Amino acid sequence: GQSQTRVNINAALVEDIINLEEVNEEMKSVIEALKDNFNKTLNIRTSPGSLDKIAVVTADGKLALNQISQISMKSPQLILVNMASFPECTAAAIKAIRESGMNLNPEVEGTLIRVPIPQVTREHREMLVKLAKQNTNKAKDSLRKVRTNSMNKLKKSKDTVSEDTIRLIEKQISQMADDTVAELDRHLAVKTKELL
Amino acid sequence: GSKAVTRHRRVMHFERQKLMAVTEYIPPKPTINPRCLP
Amino acid sequence: RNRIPGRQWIGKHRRPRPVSAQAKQNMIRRLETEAENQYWLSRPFLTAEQERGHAAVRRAAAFQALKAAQAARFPAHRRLEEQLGHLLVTRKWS
RNA sequence: GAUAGAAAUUUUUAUCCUGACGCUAUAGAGAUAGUACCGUAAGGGAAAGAUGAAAGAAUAAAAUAAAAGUAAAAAAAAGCAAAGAUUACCCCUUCUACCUUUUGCAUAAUGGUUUAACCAGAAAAAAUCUAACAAAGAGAACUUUAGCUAGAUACCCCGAAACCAGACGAGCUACCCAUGAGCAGUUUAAAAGAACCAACUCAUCUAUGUGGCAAAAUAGUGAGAAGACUUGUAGGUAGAGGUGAAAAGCCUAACGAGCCUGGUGAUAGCUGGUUGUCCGAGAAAGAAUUUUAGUUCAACCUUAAAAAUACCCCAAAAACCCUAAAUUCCAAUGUAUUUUUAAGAGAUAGUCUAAAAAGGUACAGCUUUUUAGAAACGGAUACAACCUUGACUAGAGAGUAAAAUCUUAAUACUACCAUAGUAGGCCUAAAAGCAGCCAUCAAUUGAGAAAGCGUUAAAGCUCAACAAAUUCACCAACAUAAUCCCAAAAACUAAUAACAAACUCCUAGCCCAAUACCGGACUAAUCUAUUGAAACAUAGAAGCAAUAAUGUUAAUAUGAGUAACAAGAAGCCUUUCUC
RNA sequence: GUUUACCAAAAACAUCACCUCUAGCAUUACUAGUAUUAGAGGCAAUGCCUGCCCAGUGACACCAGUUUAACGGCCGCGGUAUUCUGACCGUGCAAAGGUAGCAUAAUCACUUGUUCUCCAAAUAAGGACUUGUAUGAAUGGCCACACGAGGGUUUUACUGUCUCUUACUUCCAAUCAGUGAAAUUAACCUUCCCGUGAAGAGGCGGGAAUAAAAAAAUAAGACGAGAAGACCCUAUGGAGCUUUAAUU
RNA sequence: UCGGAGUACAAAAAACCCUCCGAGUGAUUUUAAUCUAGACAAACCAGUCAAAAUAACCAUAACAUCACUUAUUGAUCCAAAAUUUUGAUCAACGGAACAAGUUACCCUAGGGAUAACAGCGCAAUCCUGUUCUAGAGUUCCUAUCGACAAUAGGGUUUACGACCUCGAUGUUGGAUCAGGACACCCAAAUGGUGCAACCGCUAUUAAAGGUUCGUUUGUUCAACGAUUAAAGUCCUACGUGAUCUGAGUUCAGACCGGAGCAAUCCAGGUCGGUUUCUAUCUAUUAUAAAUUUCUCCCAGUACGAAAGGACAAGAGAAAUGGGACCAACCUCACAAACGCGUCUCAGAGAUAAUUAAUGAUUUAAUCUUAACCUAAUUAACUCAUAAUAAAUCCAGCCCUAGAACAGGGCACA
């Protein structure tokens, strides 16, 4: 059974109460963000740019390690983090790194934070698959938010527009969201196969 | 009711079919074939 | 097994009934008769100017006869015999 | 607006002469009777009689033995049950039950088991016909520029949910008021809106039952069981209300608001039904409309009457950038039709085919306009619309019409040898005819610095070239569905054959189909006035005709002798045994 | 404890408790009572609480003003987080701009949100995250004992529920004897296949089949019986209910 | 509601929720009268022209003009003016003087004139094939695909239409039983491979027989666990409720989120919620002549550098299905029935796709819609073969025979 008839209405007979091109662009942006995260962070091995996005609590806010520290390579299998600008947030940086799922165990040396490269092992690959699943779930949440915004716009326009028109646009947006989440699942499966 | 121009050859009336059958082209036929005639 | 969709003779897909040699011969005979008719209808005995008013008194007389026949419409005469013949229903033997 | 509607002023002579063109037991009063019966009550409300002078003539006598239903007498392939027939019941051939509603019904759309009896068109303003008298008519009141008076011609039945008024209902149930009564045993200093569990009160779940034991039950299993408990008797609250631990619950088996009576023959643009024969003509939609489920006009059509032109219509004529089929108006001609006058109704919810278009998918048995056609008892096997066919009766005559197996199922191209400048020049690891770019000359009688395979590059295999013979050689072929394929079969005895209609001739005639609506002539059965007197005629009247309303009443069939129903045993006969 | 007697016994109603309003009083209710009282209501014992708002509509006030344990409400826009912020920084409008708590709920959709436990396997169940842009505090919010023929999920035990049914009795059933209905019924002399047809044929067309009658079974069809479809639409047809409908 | 252009090509008219423009009036002065022939148009109501004659201006015009000039507008009644006029997004524009929402508590009269299920038409969508080769495939279109395009077919999904049913054609899913198609998942016979072998990828032929058990979900689907030779796609009123269930949907009760002031509602969720029928007719109520897996040998053989590793042939065992039967085990308080237990299960022809032998058209070759005999070859299907197959005694009584009727016995004893 076919069970799902794809609809592409025009986007052009509407053009005004919803922008299907804009919605598709937002969903493509979500997909691109997921792919960029997969490429930058979880390649096979942690790099100074991979842990530059770990948020650290500072002044009741969220800031990145790259923003509040200087991350570089000292040894081929070592990462050196200099929190000279913000020595207060050293413990918060350790917390961010340690409960980060990237399997980085840092050593506190006052301010010269020392992160060894653990290894590439079966356990490391399993944790990387777990991180890939977590990031796919976060991207799915972002896609759900994007779809909810379009539904809210339709609700705003739902006082003078025909009920059939609103239903058709809702079906189209749901179809786009389903296609994008299927693409997200495919990318996650490909990345999992690559890691394992 | 079909349009005047269609894609399915738009089958004709029986009278028109008979008219075309009657008016089919009849090529001339010589009394004796000339291939291996002198 | 070989169904004909819809009705046999009205739909987009009809029954492919062909044309027979008898039908062709009948049409050819009708065409020959019509060709003879249109040959006989080619050369008139009189021309348009010669026929102008050649039989007009007869048409006027026919119309006048029709008018007179229509104008003669009127109720019929009532006679004493018609009224007095109803008493004959009680004629007996003395 | 629908409709309502006087008055001032006029006319009206006592009594008998009164009975019936009213019914005859489904009629006439409901009536044998307001009785049986049905409801608590108000209230509703029937059916049922047939001998004879004598039954103090029942060893009783005569008329019909005519409805449906049975028996006498069950049936023998096959088919809307019949018709054509036939020596012969079937066997042969042909016909898609009837009303109603629809564009269209065998439709598997509605209605009906059958019989009998009842059951449904009603009005005279304007008009038509006939008659009296007529510038006047009418037996009083009015109308009159041929009119007035009289007579005859006309307009149905059943059905709601509802609304209002007044009665009757709290013996069921909802809640109160009086008066009484029940709760045994066990655990607890307890009679604790405690616990177990009886009587008792409810009714969670399941299975039977579903015209049942029962218009709410049986079996098992459940909850409460000293309380906001169950229950007897009696009283109260009554419908624009009562009562409600709000379920819009309950208020006498149907409560979003009881039942009965009256208004009431409520009203339905909605459905169903609407009863004798024959004949004449006969209609598919433009505009308004709380209107598109309907009406009122127009256009068509019917019935009468006046007239005179009516359709077909050659020229000529009808716009400007281009424009088809063809239109409008017109003499002649072939026919007889048309227009006005007076009465009028139905219809105004449509199907396909051919053509010009539009929307859609250059889709529909799709939707909307314009032109034409059809709605056979023949043909296309069956069939609405396609084709043939100016529709009467009888014949055991004939001639014709449309129409009865459609076209191909097709594509072969074979020997013969191929050497030379030279690996042409550049690029490239290599580029030798062939990743690539440029030149494309030349040796031989004849062979392209090479048209395809092949090598990393070479090699090697072919094509064109000569020499040898040389039938013909350009494109064209294309799977499938679901219960079981679908007349059988046939390539040559002469064919512009033959057979084939509601067509057309022939012999006679009573001398041409039909739905809604319209017109006409007859007519079954009753009563009356006159005839008649082995059952009728002329007139006048209507309770004036039923194959159809899930019609009413009564009787009958089918289902069906089916579902279902019942009495412990023996015995000495009501005495002993088993539960 | 109560409820839709006759398809719903419930999470619905009531309930002790806590809060609001209305009343200073006499011979038939309230009541032969007198504000520690009596009526009109909300929410539901208890424990912690019940946050902000009188802008509008009500009610007192007959105008101001007061009242939300009265009806009710408790933000929008720009930017920053790789996309995705309810967080923050500004800005504008407001009567205030959702406090505590709980949280993928019995809570629009997304949705089978993510993760862990349970199982060999779970869209089930439980715990945690939660951002519920439509949760939320007497139209009450959170936990807790006891209770529940309430709705879901586990563990042993038990078994014909099941693998996979079997044997035997009673009532049924079949025959004999008696009595004897109901829905239903145009008439049937009441086949199958393909095709056609008001578009699903016993009755039409082309073919097959075909001595006639009983008795017992099964239910595929007779668009089977039952109830002038309760779903949908129409009706210048009703009725119940609510009002910011029109006359009052 | 009114007008213009196209549809509607040339007298008039002519529709669509057909394609486009517009109007609900402004500016200016020439402030544009009365009466009456004859006409256009038209259902009616309304709308339009207009000769002659009249009083005032040139003593020679008066139709007010322009903005596409065409539309710029409203009937009676009734209200107001000073008797002459005026008054409506009465715009639902032939107009009721003034009136909303909701009903799932609903009712009545109808409609298949009109929707939800099914059927039917079409094939937009879906699904199958072929034609065409640019491109991937190292070179190489077609081993496997194959864009832009062409053409033919099927009627599984959604939609479209509204033709049969609303004086009823009862719905998803599941249980039982399945009939059929082939567009074959397995089993069988082959062609090509970028086929060394094992695994594979495609295509041809074949429909007699099969196509599992479980967790979650009402689920069809879907995910997951364990297997299998495989766990096929569909049609059958999305087969089958006068055979069954009612978990979901879709009645009356009630919460939650939201909308509405409310009644009430949500293509939202959750709990609960009556599934009748005694069969009249048609139809039907048992003959067979097997299938598939697994183990061992082949064999560590062929094939492969090695890792890996068959086929064919030969032996057995098991399961399913068909038909039967109680010696034992088991259910078993009847001597029987019964499974959980035991027994049996087959030869020939025939073919489709595809291989080769001989050999003309075309003195070569060539499996031949060329004859002659040819052989290797699927599943069906028929037939060998198997079963029944002695007519006219039937009162009664037994029976491993049976509803009744039937059928077997009644001499050993």
Ligand SMILES: Nc1nc2c(ncn2[C@@H]2O[C@H](COP(=O)(O)O)[C@@H](O)[C@H]2O)c(=O)[nH]1
């Ligand atoms: N409106 C209209 N209905 C017609 C016409 N002819 C027949 N009918 C209707 O068609 C039905 C009968 O069909 P017919 O017998 O004419 O084929 C009846 O309902 C009848 O009223 C007509 O010309 N106009």
Ligand SMILES: Nc1nc2c(ncn2[C@@H]2O[C@H](COP(=O)(O)O)[C@@H](O)[C@H]2O)c(=O)[nH]1
């Ligand atoms: N304005 C107006 N009202 C009319 C007319 N004819 C009748 N009416 C009625 O008269 C009434 C006038 O009331 P008003 O509207 O002046 O209070 C309304 O009911 C209106 O419908 C008319 O021609 N014009």
Ligand SMILES: [Mg+2]
């Ligand atoms: Mg047409």
Ligand SMILES: [Mg+2]
């Ligand atoms: Mg058909």
Ligand SMILES: [Mg+2]
């Ligand atoms: Mg057709």
Ligand SMILES: [Mg+2]
């Ligand atoms: Mg009026």
Ligand SMILES: [Mg+2]
């Ligand atoms: Mg009587």
Ligand SMILES: [Mg+2]
């Ligand atoms: Mg009789």
Ligand SMILES: [Mg+2]
């Ligand atoms: Mg016969």
Ligand SMILES: [Mg+2]
């Ligand atoms: Mg017919």
Ligand SMILES: [Mg+2]
């Ligand atoms: Mg009609």
Ligand SMILES: [Mg+2]
């Ligand atoms: Mg119809």
Ligand SMILES: [Mg+2]
């Ligand atoms: Mg039918």
Ligand SMILES: [Mg+2]
């Ligand atoms: Mg029908």
Ligand SMILES: [Mg+2]
């Ligand atoms: Mg009907």
Ligand SMILES: [Mg+2]
């Ligand atoms: Mg019928």
